[PDB]
Amino acid sequence: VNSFSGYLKLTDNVYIKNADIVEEAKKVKPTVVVNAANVYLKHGGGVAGALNKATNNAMQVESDDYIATNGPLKVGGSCVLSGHNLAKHCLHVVGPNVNKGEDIQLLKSAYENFNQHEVLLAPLLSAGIFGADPIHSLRVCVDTVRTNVYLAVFDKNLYDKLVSSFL
Numbered sequence: 001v002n003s004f005s006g007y008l009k010l011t012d013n014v015y016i017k018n019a020d021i022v023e024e025a026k027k028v029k030p031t032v033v034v035n036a037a038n039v040y041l042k043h044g045g046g047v048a049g050a051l052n053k054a055t056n057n058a059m060q061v062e063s064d065d066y067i068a069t070n071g072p073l074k075v076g077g078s079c080v081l082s083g084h085n086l087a088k089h090c091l092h093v094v095g096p097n098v099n100k101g102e103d104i105q106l107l108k109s110a111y112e113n114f115n116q117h118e119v120l121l122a123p124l125l126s127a128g129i130f131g132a133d134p135i136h137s138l139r140v141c142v143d144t145v146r147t148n149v150y151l152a153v154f155d156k157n158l159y160d161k162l163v164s165s166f167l
Ligand SMILES: Nc1nccc2ccccc12
Pocket: 019, 020, 021, 022, 046, 047, 050, 123, 124, 128, 152, 153, 154, 155
């Protein structure tokens, strides 16, 4: 049993809700919240900008030190950093950004990072300002992630379309 409430069950392991990931993270304090990161961990906008704002910029400060030591992530890659006030850990995952011309086949590689964590609160990778089709992102998620994932979808309209169209 876990703390997640109000989710619709899509599969054995994937759950979805129309919810604010920050507001959801603040309520649940999950072991892992996933960030929709870029390779530079520059948390300007979208999910990343919202998560970072909720940490009062502490996520960005930590991320800048990570990059100064390790250099950029790979598209499809990830790193584990602090969850600050939102979670124990933040798994920063880089999905391909279609608005930069990145290979959408890298979306499966991105989701494979989730399999290193038994339970996660996450957004749909490569959705929103990353430019991919969220219906496609949900399909790749279901077909790739084997651990228990609780997806937060900010937009109610999109939430209802994802559920109605789910095979
Ligand atoms: N805040 C938040 N929560 C879940 C999904 C999102 C997608 C895009 C921007 C913000 C989001």
